[PDB]
Ligand binder design. Structure first.
Ligand SMILES: [Mg+2]
Ligand SMILES: [Zn+2]
Lengths: 620, 1061, 49
DNA sequence: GGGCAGTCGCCGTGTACCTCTCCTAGAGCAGCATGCG
RNA sequence: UUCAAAGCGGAGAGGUA
DNA sequence: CGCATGCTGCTCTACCTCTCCATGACGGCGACTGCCC
């Protein structure tokens, strides 16, 4: 039930490139071609009629308004003006329409010529240096060696070689009919059109069947490329460009600085250079200029289009105002600061804030303290809804004015808005999944976030300057899922190893160690008998025994002493068969060949406090 | 303390530029001649007739202008044949001038030029080892400016030469092309058979073929020519305009190779090349007097300051100017010319402006307090135009070399990517005229230190054969050295010798550290990392309302404050006749009057106050050199950055946990730790093609309830309290659409309030310069007083940072056996794991000093006099305080540093005594009022339609990809999808979500975000045919291409979410 | 591993039992190693360069 | 032909937040202050 | 009946965790 | 008493070439290149 299922990529034919642009109008002509390098008008902030910002091609600048101003109103739908032929519709369509530029001479795509694998060189059975020399007008190439002895197909000639061959072909004495053709331009279109993929593949297979040596991998690569082109039903000559497309004008906008100066993009300069060189070359071709200048113009146009596609890949980098390079089309997508890693795999979001963190004791784990100045901003729509429904206000404008005026009712509404609504807290270097956690907020006074001390090692937090970010979930699914999968009170163990992660760490372990240790001095009240642990705690609370004294208590349960003597000691067989075995830390008294009658433990009031606290927490 | 002027690198460099830096560049370019040789221009660059500045320092500061002068050079134009000489004076440019403190004022901002540590010119030898081959040696010859030369020895015994980055070629070609016969190069070399091997292997060359081959290898593809090779060599190495060794380059070449060439000649010659080849041969053959070089040694490194960099910029501008002059001079056949109409000063003006405003060596001044300002001018950088790059600097450049001793501080650096790349000059170091750092020593004769014989300054290479003793050795009568074994340094190693064999002794024990690190008492009891932290954090403190001196200072405070130029001392030795908040006057003994004016509540680069107050009263006897008035961060004479407060070391009920700080409420209502911050706002009235802009109070769509405090001219009044969203200046623009004006008056940003203290304004037709197209400028200054509060950062001098978490009423704090509640409680868990033992010494000595009213001073490394000097002094002081006061609870012998403390909530004493004292704490510039931000909905980006970023423009928080991974590991699917689409860039789902939340319904399903469509358009524009397809249901039907860029729902889609009504 | 020693005084060199031997190889064509191993003495006296 | 050492060029090198400054050359055209008889 | 006037890109330098 | 000339602000467009702007990073991997059989 989704809109689409997969994404497919392929080579672009000139028909497709012209079809992306070239829309139609209710008349006898099409509009989608860019012909002049003007961007905007200097006197009035308006775009020209045939340029990089035109309105007949790319759409109107202001929605439901024409260039001449004759038309207006949303009544006019799908009707084009007459004085200037600008369709009347929304201006957002400006970031869709493309347009195109028609080249007076073919140029080669630099991705398919200058690559780590070069596909033109592989297809043509030629080294990269020879192809690069034929392009850029450094040498010639023979297209038909007919009726000659020292000339072969796809052989690189030179200026002097071509002149000396011309000295013989132009004599027309004999034995030179069927004039051979040599061409110092690209002529890559002719060489790639002459390909006959099916029989080339058959011949390559027939050769690869017999003999291998150690260097048949070249023929394997050629066969792979040929089979790819056969299967895709593409044409190799599409690697040489004849038209190019133009990006919509909102993706290369004009921005105005503070002092009235313009900061134009780097794509506009490259497009301007391409258009200017193309127009000049077409003009020269019209007048039938000498060929040695037309070739210079063609080489310059090749270099311009190459610099537009990718800057500094083959030749020299094109520098702009300063000596810094311009940003081409490939720099938009390729880097770490390119589109992929900066805008698609991570973005900026709404309903978010950031502040410093302080320590909050007396908080429970799963609770956090949020300042009152951030909550009124992150929770605005819920406050507005509650103000409209209960405490009937009227409209949204009155609710916003009430919030702005800082009425006392605002905080009463907010306190009941935020209860039961979880919030997600995050710290900067998120190294594992416990760097984002969900809490329940409590409104505090101040400008710092309060964090429970028991979650610091998970976040790797510390209260000497650290900062945290806050996000809120909006829908029911996000809320239920944050409560049920991410709440900070259900993150006991770690995913790397099953060891516990929420334990008293720094100042609580010191307190437990002091409370439960032993002290040879300060032992007032040692050797006193108590019934149950609560009596001992009550006797210590009102000062009558020390925190480190040794006392006997009555405790029927399981004990675990350190430095214990597992062998019974001081067995006194008393009367009536009753036996009272006295250990180092226990005084069990057992009946005759029967069960246990009583037990006593020699311990310390601090240990009684510790164990009573644990037992009370578990049983309640 | 023999300390001379601390900021003297900048002053010496600028004085050198003025004296002989501009003359040398102006006179190296003067005779400009055209090709016919008929006209000549001479620049008599010796007068310069500098014109006095039109604006004072204060006028430039308050007007937001530039402090500069004008340069005029006399020129003469000479016509050959027909005698015709014209004389005149031409305008060359505007030179910004250096103020009395070593800084520049550019566009109303204080700027400083940083010093740069680079590699010195000369010849450097190195030995490289192959994977399987022998050792092969190479030499590199590097000039101040020009082409580099490289010699290399092969595995077979062959010598090869490389020029710049051309191909390698045998040395015989180069030596014969230079014009040397076989006999002289045979005699000069010491081992001629080693070179004879190369001669035999590569074939003898004559001059003609030598130049032929040299031309062929340097510039391939052209027909060889003898004159071509001659011109190429002359332009490459022997041209003063294209090659320059420098004075230092000639000095280093002569020093290493042992030559005798004159100091005036600054281009390469034949003897240098012959000597370099001979040295390479000897190093290969292990002659005995040859050695490879270390490039990190401070004897191979140089310092460049403002003079040299300005000289280079002037040279470039002058080259451009000469090009313009030569182009313009020949365009006219008839003379009809004057030297004034020939020169155009635009390129030179542009070059100077670019150097002083947009370079990466001119930096915005650090001005939080006088200490930061002082240490910003003594900083050394290894990066810049002519140094290193961040990706190329590695482990070897960021280390400590044994040659930094006494020249670069080993403590003060940044932490992070800049650690080891920026350093600080030590206390006693100074730079000589070649560019090398020196340091002073005293002479030792027969074991006796001669403290009366003018200490000598020595560079890193000089003090390698001597045995140098440290500055902590103890003498008996400022004479003979006591002891039997003495530590010394010999050839970058630490040894011990008898004290009849040392040569020099360092001046002071603090000669090794900088000025910021010299202000930490009891430093030798601290770790080095925490010392770095404390020294760095001492420069982020904020000047307080009433400053106060430390009780346990170190002795360098009065010298660190005299360089900022804010303390006034009387030169008179007389009487004081008039004292006022803004003026002081002192009369001598019949020696006229001296009057001083004081700055009042000014503003620094970082929005801090710059007040100045008097100390004296009327009719006071005053001596020479006595302090008369002092600045905003100094008590009488000396620096005062913090306050002395009562401290106890113990844990509270969890409020001390992991560096948090618990303070008392006395620090709030006693106005301790409160400061003044001043901000500046600006508005501009410009003109537009539609029309001009007018500043007036007739603003549309506003009521009289919002125009109370405007002065019937549209500008607020001095002394008004402004809260958030209040109009300051009222402006209207002439929009095109009755009333045709629109309101965009400037208002205070959200979160700002205070008093209006200044409304200075400037306009045309009054003598004020304005940027083009503007009519008037209005500047408003707003001040406020800030108190300490929960979330602020506090610090000490020993590296202990913290954030305040609670402010207790004074009846809850623990109190002493006399009833005095404490001021701060600190956790003792943070001391033993980080090894700041000096803070306890400081606390105990401050306690004794408070009880005695003494104000002790202790200098670092104080244990050369005894075995445990600090402990004994502290114990003796505490015992003396106990005997003088009469209270026995002050000091106890069982627990020296600990006394009894009670609980303010219950009244019961704690089980064991705790440590209390007086601590000197500072308040840093990181305040929580500037770190809190929140957003619900605001502006969006233009291309991607994602929320903007930034606190100042209602920006959103970034959800990077690490957080995406964390949400994927949880199993979260709906939180992630809500974050990615509805809250970022789903242009239609944002409004639907907001309206659903307000109305109380369910949030609808999202669509495709805009960034994916942007990426598809960008990929299509690269001639790639990419599309999205929907699969066919039946068998032979074709898959259908889906059109993403076409909304099917003809419903409202605004650019930003809006509330329905 | 290797370690180079340096003289603590200046003067002339006297051998006691060290017999040098030029041991050539692929790298050290001029490396003359010791063969027996004895005592090396440095007689005192200032040295002029 | 086979098999290389040797060499040249392109790819890659932590996250989140805060403060400050500055941002295209050349040529063409029209209107106001200044020294002289 | 209509909204609507406050948002902008790049480069360099420094800092906090 | 009046007449002739340099300076400043606005506008309008167009781009290619060098003496090459550097020659202190380090590893991996693939594509030429001269040399010895
Ligand atoms: Mg921290
Ligand atoms: Zn129209």
């Amino acid at each position: 039930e989704q809109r689409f299922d997969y994404v497919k990529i392929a080579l672009a034919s000139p028909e497709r490139i012209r079809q992306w642009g070239e829309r139609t109008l209710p008349n006898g002509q099409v509009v989608g071609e860019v012909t002049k390098p003007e961007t905007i008008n200097y006197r009035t902030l308006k775009p020209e009629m045939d340029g990089l910002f035109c309105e007949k091609i790319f759409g109107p600048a202001k929605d439901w308004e024409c260039h001449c101003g004759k038309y207006k109103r949303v009544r006019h739908r799908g009707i084009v003006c007459e004085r200037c032929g600008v369709e009347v519709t929304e201006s957002r369509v400006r970031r869709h329409r493309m347009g195109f530029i028609k080249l007076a001479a073919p140029v080669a795509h630099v991705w398919y010529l200058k690559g780590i694998p070069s596909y033109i060189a592989i297809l043509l059975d030629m080294p990269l240096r020879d192809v690069e020399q034929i392009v850029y007008f450094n040498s010639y190439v023979v297209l038909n060696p007919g009726n000659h002895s020292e000339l072969q197909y796809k052989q690189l000639l030179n200026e002097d070689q071509w002149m000396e061959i011309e000295d013989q072909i132009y004599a027309e004495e004999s034995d030179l009919e069927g004039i051979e053709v040599g061409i110092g331009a690209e002529a890559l279109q002719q060489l790639l059109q002459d390909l006959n993929l099916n029989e080339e593949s058959e011949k390559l297979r027939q050769e690869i069947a017999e003999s291998k040596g150690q260097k048949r991998a070249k023929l394997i690569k050629r066969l792979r490329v040929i089979d790819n082109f056969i299967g895709t039903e593409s044409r190799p000559e599409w690697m040489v460009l004849n038209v190019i497309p133009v990006i919509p004008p909102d993706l290369r906008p004009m921005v105005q600085l503070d002092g009235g100066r313009f900061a134009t993009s780097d794509l506009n300069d490259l497009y301007r250079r391409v258009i200017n060189r193309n127009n000049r070359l077409a003009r020269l071709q019209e007048i039938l200029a000498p060929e040695i200048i037309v070739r210079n113009e063609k080489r310059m146009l090749q270099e311009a289009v190459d610099a537009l596609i990718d800057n500094g890949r083959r030749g020299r980098t094109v520098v702009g105002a300063n000596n810094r390079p311009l940003k081409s089309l490939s720099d938009i997508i390729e880097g770490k600061q390119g589109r992929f890693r900066q805008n698609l795999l991570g973005k900026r979001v709404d309903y978010s804030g950031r502040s410093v963190i302080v320590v909050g004791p007396n908080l429970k784990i799963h609770q956090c303290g949020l300042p009152r100045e951030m909550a009124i901003e992150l929770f605005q729509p819920f406050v507005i809804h509650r103000l409209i429904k209960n405490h009937s206000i009227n409209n949204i404008k009155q609710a916003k004015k009430l919030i702005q005026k800082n009425d006392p009712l605002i905080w009463d509404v907010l306190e009941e808005v935020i209860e039961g609504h979880p919030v997600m807290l995050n710290r900067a270097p998120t190294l594992h999944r416990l760097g984002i956690q969900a809490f329940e907020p409590i409104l505090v006074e101040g400008r710092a976030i309060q964090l429970h001390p028991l979650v610091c090692p998970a976040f790797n937090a510390d209260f000497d300057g650290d900062q945290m970010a806050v996000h809120v979930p909006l829908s029911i699914e996000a809320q239920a899922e944050a409560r049920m999968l991410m709440l900070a009170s259900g993150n006991i163990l770690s995913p790397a190893t099953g060891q516990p992660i929420v334990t008293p760490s720094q100042d609580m372990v010191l307190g437990c160690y002091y409370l439960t240790a032993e002290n040879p001095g300060a032992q007032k009240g040692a050797g006193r008998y108590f019934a149950n642990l609560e009596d001992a705690i009550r006797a210590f609370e009102q000062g009558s025994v020390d925190l480190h004294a040794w006392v006997w208590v009555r405790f029927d349960g399981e004990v675990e002493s350190e430095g214990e003597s597992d062998e019974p000691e001081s067995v006194v067989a008393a009367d009536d068969g009753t036996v009272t075995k006295t250990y180092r830390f226990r005084r069990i008294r057992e009946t005759e060949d029967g069960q246990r009658l009583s037990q006593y433990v020699k311990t310390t009031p601090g240990r009684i406090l510790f164990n009573n606290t644990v037992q009370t927490a578990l049983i309640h | 303390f023999h300390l001379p002027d601390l900021v003297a690198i900048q002053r010496n460099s600028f004085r050198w530029f003025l004296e002989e830096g501009l003359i040398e560049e102006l006179e190296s370019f003067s005779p400009i001649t055209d090709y016919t040789g008929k006209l000549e221009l001479h620049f008599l660059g010796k007068q310069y007739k500098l014109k006095r500045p039109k604006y004072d320092v204060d006028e430039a500061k308050r007007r937001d202008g530039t402090y500069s002068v004008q340069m005029y050079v006399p020129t003469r134009l000479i016509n050959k044949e027909t005698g015709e000489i014209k004389e005149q004076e031409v305008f060359i440019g505007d030179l910004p001038l250096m103020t009395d403190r070593g800084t520049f004022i550019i566009n109303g901002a204080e700027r400083v030029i940083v010093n740069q540590i680079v590699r010195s010119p000369g010849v450097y030898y190195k030995s490289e080892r192959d994977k399987n081959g022998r050792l092969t040696h190479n030499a590199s010859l590097i000039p101040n400016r020009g082409a580099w030369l490289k010699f290399e020895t092969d595995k077979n015994g062959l010598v090869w030469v490389r020029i710049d980055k051309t191909r390698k070629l045998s040395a015989q070609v180069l030596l014969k092309a230079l014009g040397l016969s076989d006999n002289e190069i045979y005699d000069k070399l010491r081992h001629p058979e080693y070179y004879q091997k190369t001669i035999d292997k590569e074939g003898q060359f004559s001059e003609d073929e030598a130049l032929m081959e040299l031309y062929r290898k340097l510039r391939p593809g052209e027909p060889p020519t003898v004159s071509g090779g001659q011109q190429l060599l002359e332009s490459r190495f022997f041209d003063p305009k294209r090659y320059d060794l420098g004075r230092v380059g000639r000095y280093k070449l002569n020093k290493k190779l042992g030559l005798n060439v004159a100091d005036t000649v600054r281009t390469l010659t034949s003897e240098d090349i012959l000597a370099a080849i001979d040295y390479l041969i000897n190093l290969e053959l292990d002659l005995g007097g040859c050695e490879v070089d270390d490039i990190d040694h401070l004897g191979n490194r140089r310092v460049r300051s403002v003079g040299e960099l300005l000289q280079n910029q002037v040279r470039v501008g002058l080259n451009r100017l000469e090009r313009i002059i030569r182009e313009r001079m020949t365009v006219s056949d008839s003379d009809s010319l004057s030297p004034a109409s020939l020169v155009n000063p635009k390129p030179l003006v542009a070059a100077i402006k670019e150097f002083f405003g947009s370079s990466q060596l001119s930096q915005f001044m650090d001005q939080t307090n006088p200490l930061a300002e002082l240490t910003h001018k003594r900083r050394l950088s290894a990066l810049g135009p002519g140094g290193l790059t961040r990706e190329r600097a590695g482990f070897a450049v960021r280390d400590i070399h044994p040659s930094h001793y006494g020249r670069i501080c080993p403590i003060e650096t940044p932490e992070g990517p800049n650690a080891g790349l920026i350093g600080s000059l030590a206390t006693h170091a100074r730079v000589n005229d070649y560019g090398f750092i020196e340091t002073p020593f005293w002479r030792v004769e027969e074991g006796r230190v001669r403290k009366d014989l003018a200490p000598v300054y020595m560079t890193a290479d000089q003090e390698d054969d001597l045995r140098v003793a440290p500055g902590d050795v103890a003498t008996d009568d400022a004479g003979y050295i006591l002891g039997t074994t003495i530590p010394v340094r010999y050839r970058q190693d630490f040894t011990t010798t008898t004290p009849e064999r040392v040569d020099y002794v360092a001046l002071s024990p603090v000669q090794i550290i900088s000025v910021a690190t010299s202000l930490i008492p009891f430093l030798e009891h601290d770790d080095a990392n925490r010392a770095l932290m404390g020294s760095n954090m001492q420069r982020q403190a904020v000047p307080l309302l009433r400053p106060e001196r430390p009780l346990v200072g170190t002795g360098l405070e009065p010298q660190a404050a005299r360089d900022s130029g804010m303390v006034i001392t009387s030169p008179v030795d007389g009487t004081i006749s008039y004292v006022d908040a803004t003026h002081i006057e002192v009369t001598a003994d019949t020696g006229e009057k001296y009057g001083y004016a004081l700055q009042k509540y000014q503003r620094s680069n970082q929005d801090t106050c710059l007040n100045q107050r008097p100390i004296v009263f009327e009719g006071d006897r005053v001596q020479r050199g006595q302090v008369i008035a002092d600045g905003s961060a100094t008590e009488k004479g000396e620096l005062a950055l913090g306050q002395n407060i009562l401290v106890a070391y113990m844990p509270w009920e969890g409020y001390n946990y992991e560096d948090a700080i618990l303070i008392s409420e006395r620090l709030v209502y006693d106005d301790v730790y409160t400061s003044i911050h001043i901000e500046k706002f600006e508005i501009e009235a410009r003109q537009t093609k539609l029309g001009p802009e007018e500043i007036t109070r007739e603003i549309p769509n506003v009521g009289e309830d919002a125009l109370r405090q405007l002065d019937e001219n549209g500008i607020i009044r001095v002394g008004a309290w402004v809260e958030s969203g209040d109009i300051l200046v009222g402006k209207v623009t002439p929009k095109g659409e009755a009333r045709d004006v629109r309101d965009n008056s400037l208002r205070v940003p959200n979160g700002e309030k205070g008093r209006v203290v200044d409304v200075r304004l400037f306009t045309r037709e009054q003598g004020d310069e304005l940027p083009p197209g503007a009519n008037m400028v209005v500047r408003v200054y707003v001040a406020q007083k800030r108190k300490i509060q929960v979330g602020d950062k506090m610090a000490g001098r020993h590296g202990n940072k913290g954030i305040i978490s609670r402010i207790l009423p004074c009846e809850d704090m623990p109190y002493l056996p006399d009833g005095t509640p404490l001021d701060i409680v600190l956790n003792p868990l943070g001391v033993p794991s980080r090894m700041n033992v000096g803070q306890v010494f400081e606390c105990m000595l401050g306690w004794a000093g408070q009880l005695l009213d003494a104000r002790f001073k202790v200098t670092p490394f104080d244990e050369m006099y005894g075995a445990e000097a600090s402990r004994l002094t502290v114990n003796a002081k505490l015992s003396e305080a106990r005997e003088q006061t009469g209270q026995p609870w002050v000091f106890s012998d069982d627990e020296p540093g600990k006394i009894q403390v009670y609980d303010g909530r219950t009244g019961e004493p704690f089980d064991r005594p705790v440590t209390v004292g007086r601590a000197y704490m500072l308040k840093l510039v990181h305040l929580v009022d500037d770190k809190i931000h929140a957003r619900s909905t605001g502006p969006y980006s233009l291309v991607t339609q994602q929320p903007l970023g930034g606190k100042a423009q209602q920006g959103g928080q970034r959800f990077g990809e690490m957080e995406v991974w964390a949400l994927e590991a949880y199993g979260a699917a709906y939180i992630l999808q809500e974050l990615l689409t509805v809250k970022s860039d789903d242009m239609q789902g944002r409004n639907e979500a907001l309206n659903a939340i307000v109305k109380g319904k369910a949030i609808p399903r999202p669509g495709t975000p805009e960034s994916f469509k942007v990426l598809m358009r960008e990929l299509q524009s690269l001639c790639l045919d990419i599309a999205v397809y929907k699969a066919s249901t039946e068998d032979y039907e074709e898959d259908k291409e889906v059109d993403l860029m076409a909304d099917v729902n003809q419903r409202r889609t605004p650019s930003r979410p809006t509330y329905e009504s | 591993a290797t370690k180079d020693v340096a003289t603590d005084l200046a003067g002339e060199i006297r051998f006691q039992d060290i017999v040098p031997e030029e041991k050539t190889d692929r790298q050290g064509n001029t490396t003359r190693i010791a063969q027996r191993g004895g005592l090396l003495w440095v007689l005192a006296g200032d040295v002029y360069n």
